[PDB]
């Protein structure tokens, strides 16, 4: 709801690496592999639970 | 897809004269009309073709 305001709308998503732990995800970020995607956003749905995001990976980095 | 980033994504909406000519389109721009119509894009589907986009009428121009 945040990036809605952004003239580009467009996310990244990245690969965990191994032993996923959302504890570590939120406290460290190095976790996370250095390659990552960054995309556009085609439309929010969200219809049976609040968060329902489609994800394409469009522009890939490392 | 070019104009999906751009921060004012806009179609214009043109004519063609007599001598219905793509051949004519890619090589003569004279044969698109001067008079022409531009307007704010709607949304891609994509149903069955490639490329279905909608265009409308929105500012006349000469």
């Known amino acids: ?9 467009y996310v990244g998503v990245f690969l965990k690496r191994d032993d996923s732990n959302e504890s570590d995800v939120v406290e460290s970020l190095d ?20 968060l329902r995001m489609i994800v394409m ?3 890939r980095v490392h």
Chains 1, 2 share one sequence.
Do not use: N, W
Request: glycine share 10%.
């Open 31 to 50: 976790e996370i592999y250095h390659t990552g995607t960054f995309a556009q956003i085609h439309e929010m749905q969200d219809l049976g639970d609040k």
């Open 1 to 9: 709801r945040r990036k809605v305001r952004l003239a580009q709308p």
């Open 57 to 59: 990976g469009h522009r």
